[PDB]
Ligand binder design. Structure first.
Ligand SMILES: CC(C)C[C@H](NC(=O)OCC1c2ccccc2-c2ccccc21)C(=O)O
Length: 425
């Protein structure tokens, strides 16, 4: 197809391999622990699952600066390559000990956390303003589809074969994809070796009216404004529940619901598939709402954020109420994750609604602060649930629901959407 849609497809596969390499461990740890198996304790498993988010936190904002400086192509390609090779060496790191695996996961976090800003730095030069929505949607849906596919796929490989083949498969697939990314993609349409003249003129002429402003991202602004911290804490509360689910759901099904590894992998993707299919309709629902009602822009934000952050909390509480039920617990979990889909138009769009031309930096700040739950939630949750502890699983579900409620309340108490009065260049 066209050059920019080729970039969109290759970005889709890139993010598919990013989230895969992120999530394959959450399924591999189900079989990698003893009742080749290792005698890892509950606290160790939490650290091993959470070590990735240390690197993801560390390399986020410097990754954005480097992407702005030297561009997206090489930076993202090398991030993916340095995640794939570390995944390939993870099985031998498991034999060397717990410490080697933790440092492997930390280095994977450092490699992988630069991917998102490197992609935004490419779409700052590739996506025309009229068409940015479709391109960003196609590019970023790769992450969600990556989780949705890599859960059952990891389960299938981990059941039919040993768990090491999961890591080998994803590592070799990452290397193979890098062999395409280094070749078909370029930093900027002027630097593209094969783009047609008319497409290049279209992209440049459409981006001219924005790049002619010459005032985008001139400094690190004074981010004292409370409306930024309200959306930051909303993102924190959302990511807390999302990552607590992502890093524990296969473990939860193995430990409480007692599903087989294959069935565990199949069922673990249902909540995220539901979340994807709800998020994709959420934009159309928001358009339908905007088409009729005289609501202010803040109104749709607050209603959608409340729905998408409260529904998951109440349904996670409900899943706590009838835990150990092989049929109803998974239904409540998938309903929770599906209701979580409204959060995009609830608060994720607010990042660029309250401050255009600063979205790439403000969203990076918010994502740096909101990946603290990736480091905190998994380890404390695994510490709180030592062996079976249906009561402690209820306890962690209550903790996640309370965090969601706090985030929704704080966001709705301080959400603004016009202008921060300093972002107006
Ligand atoms: C609102 C849409 C366009 C954004 C969405 N992006 C996405 O990557 O979701 C994955 C999940 C998430 C959901 C909502 C807000 C933040 C996050 C996030 C951050 C880090 C890792 C995973 C996630 C899309 O375009 O489909």
């Amino acid at each position: 197809c066209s050059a920019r849609y080729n970039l969109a497809i290759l970005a889709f596969f890139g993010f598919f391999i990013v989230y895969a390499l992120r999530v394959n461990l959450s399924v591999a740890l189900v079989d990698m622990v003893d009742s080749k198996k290792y005698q890892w304790d509950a606290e160790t498993q939490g650290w091993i699952l959470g070590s990735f988010f240390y690197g993801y936190i560390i390399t986020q904002i410097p990754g954005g600066y480097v992407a702005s400086k030297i561009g997206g192509k090489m930076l993202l390609g090398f991030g993916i390559l340095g995640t794939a090779v570390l995944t390939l060496f993870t099985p031998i790191a498991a034999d060397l000990g717990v410490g080697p695996l933790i440092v492997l996961r930390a280095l994977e976090g450092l490699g992988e956390g630069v991917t998102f800003p490197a992609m935004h730095a490419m779409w700052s030069s590739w996506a025309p303003p009229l068409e940015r929505s479709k391109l960003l949607s196609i590019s970023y849906a790769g992450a969600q589809l990556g989780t949705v596919i890599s859960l059952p796929l990891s389960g299938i490989i981990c059941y039919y074969m040993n768990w090491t083949y999961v890591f080998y498969f994803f590592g070799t697939i990452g290397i193979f994809w890098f062999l395409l990314w280094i070749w078909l993609v370029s930093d900027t349409p002027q630097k593209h070796k094969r783009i047609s003249h008319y497409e290049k003129e279209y992209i440049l002429s459409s981006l001219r009216n924005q790049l002619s402003s010459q005032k985008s991202v001139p400094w690190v602004p004074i981010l004292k404004s409370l409306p930024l911290w309200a959306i930051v804490v909303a993102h924190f509360s959302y990511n807390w529940t999302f990552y607590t689910l992502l890093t524990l759901l296969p473990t939860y099904m193995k430990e409480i619901l007692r599903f087989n590894v294959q069935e565990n992998g199949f069922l673990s993707s249902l909540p995220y598939l539901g979340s994807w299919l709800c998020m994709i309709l959420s934009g159309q629902a928001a358009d339908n709402l905007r088409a009729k009602w005289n609501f202010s822009t803040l109104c749709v934000r607050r209603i959608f954020s409340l729905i998408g952050m409260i529904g998951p909390a109440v349904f996670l509480v409900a899943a706590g109420f009838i835990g150990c039920d092989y049929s109803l617990a998974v239904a409540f979990l998938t309903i929770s994750t599906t209701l979580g889909g409204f959060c995009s138009s609830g608060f994720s769009i607010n990042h660029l609604d309250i401050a255009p031309s600063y979205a790439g930096i403000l969203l990076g700040i918010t994502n740096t602060f909101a990946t603290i739950p990736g480091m905190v939630g998994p380890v404390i949750a695994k510490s709180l649930t030592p062996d079976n502890t249906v009561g402690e699983w209820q306890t962690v579900f209550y903790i996640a629901a309370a965090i969601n409620v706090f985030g929704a309340i704080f966001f709705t108490l301080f959400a603004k959407g016009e202008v921060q009065n300093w972002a107006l260049n």
